[PDB]
Design a protein around this ligand. Structure first.
Ligand SMILES: Nc1nc2c(c(=O)[nH]1)N[C@@H](C(=O)O)CN2
Ligand SMILES: Nc1nc2c(c(=O)[nH]1)N[C@@H](C(=O)O)CN2
Ligand SMILES: Nc1nc2c(c(=O)[nH]1)N[C@@H](C(=O)O)CN2
Ligand SMILES: Nc1nc2c(c(=O)[nH]1)N[C@@H](C(=O)O)CN2
Ligand SMILES: Nc1nc2c(c(=O)[nH]1)N[C@@H](C(=O)O)CN2
Ligand SMILES: Nc1nc2c(c(=O)[nH]1)N[C@@H](C(=O)O)CN2
Ligand SMILES: [Zn+2]
Ligand SMILES: [Zn+2]
Ligand SMILES: [Zn+2]
Ligand SMILES: [Zn+2]
Ligand SMILES: [Zn+2]
Ligand SMILES: [Zn+2]
Lengths: 120, 118, 118, 120, 115, 114
């Protein structure tokens, strides 16, 4: 038995991949509508009937969200190589201290491609 | 090793009774709720499936009819109709008729949801 | 040049003038999607008609009356069909957004209404 | 009575808007997964049973597409103020000559926001 | 103007007869079809017609398209999106006289609008 | 910190029918390829998404705009069979493959793990 909760956010950002070979399109300056899913695993409270309000999860993420949205990721410390993989771990590292029930972070650069980091 | 899922969508009203006064989720409202039933089992060597998708549809239909175009709070067991409670409630209704049931996901909106594994 | 912005709100309604027994007459709800269309001149210097965020800000007061609410309680929405709601929204927004040229309301992902000028 | 045809493309680009008031988030370097819908109108051919092949409409757009995808829009001449409105007309101006049957270009910055240019 | 639309999806096979050696093969799509009606809203009911009625009016035509092979249906021997839109219109127009458009999308990224 | 997964979706337009619903028809089939592995400290990824496209492309082209029932191994082309079929085709080319999901429609699917 287990209960899991998730909430998706989308942020509009620029990035470029600094470690690909000279011809690669992703080494050019570009951007994406990045989707991030924060997944939480925990017990359902008998009174609230939830693990955590989706709104708390939003509120916890907001500070990190706002550093990402409408920004250039390469200028953010720890995102000098802003792959989806690096980004999902970085989001995990920012969010985990405030959301200890965090069990996975998914980031999708496009709606057909994504990465899931679990952390624990 | 092999998992199967089918998605359904229903149109229901609810409100959350145990939230503080200002919270908008305590007001009477509704959603286009989505529910995914996941099944796990061995694939039949002849039919080439665990179970026909139709069967999942037929099995779920009675529970679906209680939820669709209905007010959740009036259904026994759904007096605090969170996504979490609803997913467990759906599991409880469907598990007895679909013993291969391995998970229930409900999404209140396209960006928020709960998965219950039982 | 036509510009648009989509909004989604989670609400309850019931249709009071449907034939007794039809499921739409029972208390229920939807994830409603609304699209506000404006048509007009792109300023040479700004490069837009109006900022997407200005249109959002103009819609916000109306949006808050619809979201996480029961539509029948709102004056003008006692028969809250998709058609009535599209016209209602038009009547609320056209005053604050003069360039408004269409309102689409989607009740579900597959069913909707579009209103302009009757 | 009349028949319209459309084909949808998505590209991943960076941009910023240089004439928005100071502190606007749109004025910071950022990006999107842009969607563009090319709309044509005209007669169906009684033999082929279409106006044109979808693959040929794709092929026509390809040069302009590849200028947009994985690029920074502001470097492109005419996209110095790369709003959806400017972009939509810019795409019209590049694609109309190669596809005279073009009747509308929709560009969406995000899944919930966009512009449709018709020639006015 | 007040307009109403309803979308359906059918799973069917087809091939295009008037193309060279290479989509000319037997294949299929999850076709999306959108029926658009234009009409006056009734003062009492609050609608043009019930969505459920539109579903019922289309149903026979949907049964004819869903889980079928389009080329066998008379009128759809060249089953392009353009021909289909107009053909679906021929079956539905008499049953739904307020019909104003039929959009068919063979993929999520490609389709046709007939008026 | 721990496990990292990568996926990529593909859609192909194909005809099929089941010999055991059984009428001739087709779908816009969706397939997700899932990969698990270590992220390289230099590249910052497991493998490039485009690399995963390239590796799948030969199997893709056999499926896209084709009749599935004529393909060796897909005599009974159920999603279950198709997901497992795809796994067998793709695994040797993509060793880090951890799951294969095929969606017949938007609302129905199967996930396979070899
Ligand atoms: N694995 C992996 N491959 C990628 C990306 C990414 O973030 N991860 N980014 C893609 C892009 O930014 O275009 C290019 N390929
Ligand atoms: N975790 C959790 N938070 C929620 C909900 C819910 O179902 N679960 N429902 C939301 C709502 O009904 O709007 C409010 N917040
Ligand atoms: N035309 C039309 N038909 C409808 C609706 C609606 O709003 N308009 N609402 C639907 C509903 O509320 O479920 C039922 N049928
Ligand atoms: N009308 C209009 N308003 C906009 C944009 C745009 O492209 N058009 N771009 C948005 C952005 O780039 O964030 C901000 N606001
Ligand atoms: N305009 C147009 N182009 C097409 C099609 C179609 O239906 N219309 N059919 C597509 C296909 O069915 O593969 C190929 N190209
Ligand atoms: N389990 C299962 N049931 C199915 C299918 C399928 O692929 N798997 N195929 C569906 C179809 O092709 O219509 C019908 N039912
Ligand atoms: Zn990128
Ligand atoms: Zn709710
Ligand atoms: Zn309703
Ligand atoms: Zn922008
Ligand atoms: Zn085709
Ligand atoms: Zn099928």
């Amino acid at each position: 038995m287990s209960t899991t909760l998730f909430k998706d956010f989308t942020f509009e950002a620029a990035h470029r991949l600094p470690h690909v070979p000279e011809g690669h399109k992703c080494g050019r300056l570009h951007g994406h509508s990045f989707m991030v899913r924060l997944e939480i695993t925990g017990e359902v409270d008998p009174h609230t009937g939830w693990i955590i309000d989706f709104a708390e999860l939003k509120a916890a993420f907001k500070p990190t969200y706002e550093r990402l949205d409408h920004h250039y990721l390469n200028d953010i410390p720890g995102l000098e190589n802003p792959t989806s993989e690096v980004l999902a771990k970085w989001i995990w590292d920012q969010v985990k201290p405030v959301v200890p029930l965090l069990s996975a972070v998914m980031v999708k650069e496009t709606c057909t491609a994504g990465c899931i980091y679990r952390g624990e």
